[PDB]
From a paper:
The ubiquitin E3 ligase cereblon (CRBN) is the target of therapeutic drugs thalidomide and lenalidomide and is recruited by most targeted protein degraders (PROTACs and molecular glues) in clinical development. CRBN consists of an unstructured N-terminal region and three folded domains: the Lon protease-like domain (Lon), the helical bundle (HB) which facilitates binding to the adaptor protein DDB1, and the thalidomide binding domain (TBD). We present the design of CRBNmidi, a construct that readily expresses from E. coli with high yields as soluble, stable protein without DDB1. Importantly, the stabilizing mutations introduced based on PROSS analysis proved to have beneficial effects, with the best-expressing construct (construct 8, hereafter referred to as CRBNmidi) incorporating 12 mutations.
Furthermore, to assess the suitability of CRBNmidi to study alternative, non-thalidomide scaffolds, we solved the crystal structure of CRBNmidi in complex with compound 1, a phenyl-glutarimide based binder, to a resolution of 1.95 Å. While compound 1 used for crystallization was a racemic mixture, only the (R) enantiomer fit the electron density well. The two protomers in the asymmetric unit capture two different conformations of the N-methylacetamide group in compound 1 indicating flexibility (2nd panel from top). Comparisons of the crystal structures of CRBNmidi bound to compound 1 and lenalidomide reveal that the glutarimide in compound 1 adopts a near identical binding mode to the equivalent moiety in lenalidomide (3rd panel from top). Together, these high-resolution co-crystal structures validate CRBNmidi as an enabling construct for X-ray crystallographic structure-based binder design.
Residue numbers in the entry:
A (entry chain A): 47 to 187, 250 to 267, 270 to 425
B (entry chain C): 45 to 187, 250 to 425
């Protein structure tokens, strides 16, 4: 495995002149705050998880510009029902990198943020100018469980320095990287105790199955056991396509029942040194993810896949 | 200068998919009536009766709303924002869905729609529900052939093809064709939409045409890019039309035969092309490198014109 696993976390495709912020805002337990939510964000976010964004609607640009002038923190709601904008919990996201640019006269803002604190939603109110403000309450934050989880993680993929040592940070690493659906992510986000969070995760890893194509609900694509981490963030990560759409990707060493489309391409690659090719379901041709292929034959691995969470469903 | 290409192809939006469902039904609201019509949250374009609006919708709340629209009157409200940055709008126009197709990419439900502007309105109430959707309480508004010939005369002096069949015979439709196709900024579009009477609209448009100057790149303002005399129409919609990029972003572009102070980026491409038979290359300002639009180049030697430019309204300001 010869590849710098610190390059993906940099999101260099998004831009390399990104202004950086080192100030850190952290709210007290049980404190009630009013935090804006970005209307296009759909992701469930946990503390320690990074969220890259590319925004071009003038209202999102203005609100990020104002956040950058202040505490740089927005609210990422854990929607139980994104079609209905229903959410009871969420995680704050603190912008740590920022970039302005223009394209065709349209002001664009590129942002890189990281989850900081869980919160319970108290009120979701929309302003007269359309922007949404959420009144939230900041929630407060067993090495046997940790060792047991780390044990079954090594059984799935041979991956210590990669995993956090603190039980709180480790519980959130596991919550954000397990190949689980949204309902289980929200279940884990509701849990207040790291001990309880780790114990629920152990139960989830054991009931885990395999990943089928959602459009088929039949054809198996990959499994926990080919999960393969190419990034310090872990085997699961959010990346932005060239037009602002955020994909959550699970990297696996081998996949089944998948065809390729088009020509391997290096543009806007989420894994520097690698080229991507659209992978679709060999049964329904539903796009599922991308196969990445080395650009220099001196790199290991030579082939790996990055499959979107949204295209997969567990058995 | 002579055209050897089917100007009815661009209006079909075949790049959006050629197997679009269509609807024969037509809904029209009574004059001076209050209607409650939903507003798509990411639409930003100023719409006029008779104008086409293509869309590609990703958000599950958008596709739910449009799915429900397809099962009802297929009509949403397009606001003419004074300030998009703050959702400030006093007038608008209804858009009726006339074509539709559902897709699914990476497990994400996708809706593509082609809609046409029908009736303009004044907004009485904008109110966002609990789920986030915006509903607009609106009042449908009620709807000198010398001005018409005077308008048409200076249109021909800009482009020869803008002559007869390319232009509507009715003064109401004609004032809306002109409002949608003049190379004017958003403040003038809103001014024309506010006008209640067609004769008043036509006379305002004649005044605007006489004061029309040139189009400069927005970022640096100094460099001219094109001018009204270089306009020429390659679609039955007219010289000005909205098209969707492959990711759902709607671009309003003006087609012109010649542009200055523009460099090109890379090699021509035929993917997702808005003008079948032509390839596109990103065009950018010579001075400040800002992307301005696209140069279109024919893929066959027997096509005419062999080259033209589609320049976005958003990158251009008047002189
Ligand atoms: C016509 N265009 C489209 O439909 C969308 O185009 C895309 C979408 C996703 C990417 C990913 C691929 C993986 C990677 O490494 N980086 C990316 O941005 C690239 C282009
Ligand atoms: C990083 N950029 C991408 O991945 C692709 O972005 C685009 C944007 C606009 C187009 C237009 C060009 C003109 C035309 O005729 N059709 C289009 O769709 C095409 C691709
Ligand atoms: Zn399938
Ligand atoms: Zn310029």
């Amino acid at each position: 495995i010869n590849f710098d696993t610190s390059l993906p976390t940099s999101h260099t495709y998004l831009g390399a002149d990104m202004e950086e912020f080192h100030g850190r805002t952290l709210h007290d337990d049980d404190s009630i705050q009013v935090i804006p939510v970005l209307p296009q964000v759909m992701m469930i976010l946990v503390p320690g998880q990074t969220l890259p964004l590319q925004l071009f609607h003038p209202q999102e640009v203005s609100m990020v510009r104002n956040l950058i002038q202040n505490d740089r923190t927005f609210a990422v709601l854990a929607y139980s029902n994104v079609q209905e904008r229903e959410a009871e919990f969420g995680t704050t996201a603190e912008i740590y990198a920022y970039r302005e640019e223009q394209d065709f006269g349209i002001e664009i803002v590129k942002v890189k943020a990281i989850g900081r604190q869980r919160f319970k939603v108290l009120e979701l109110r929309t302003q007269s100018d359309g922007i949404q403000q959420a009144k939230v309450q900041i929630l407060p934050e067993a090495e046997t469980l940790m060792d047991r989880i780390k044990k079954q993680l090594r059984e799935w993929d041979e991956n210590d320095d990669s995993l956090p040592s603190n039980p709180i940070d480790f519980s959130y690493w596991v919550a954000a990287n397990l190949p689980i659906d949204d309902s289980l992510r929200i279940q884990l986000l509701k849990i207040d105790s790291a001990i309880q969070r780790l114990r629920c995760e152990l139960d989830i890893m054991n009931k885990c199955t395999s990943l089928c194509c959602k459009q088929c609900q039949e054809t198996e694509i990959t499994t926990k056991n080919e999960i393969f981490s190419l990034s310090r963030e872990g085997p699961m990560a959010a990346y932005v396509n060239p037009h602002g759409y955020v994909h959550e990707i699970l990297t696996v060493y081998k996949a089944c029942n998948l065809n390729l489309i088009g020509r391997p391409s290096t543009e806007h690659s989420w894994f520097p040194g690698y080229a991507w090719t659209v992978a679709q379901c060999k049964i329904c041709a539903s796009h599922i993810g991308w196969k990445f292929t080395a650009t220099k034959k001196d790199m290991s691995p030579q082939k790996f896949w990055g499959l979107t969470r949204s295209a997969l469903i567990p058995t």
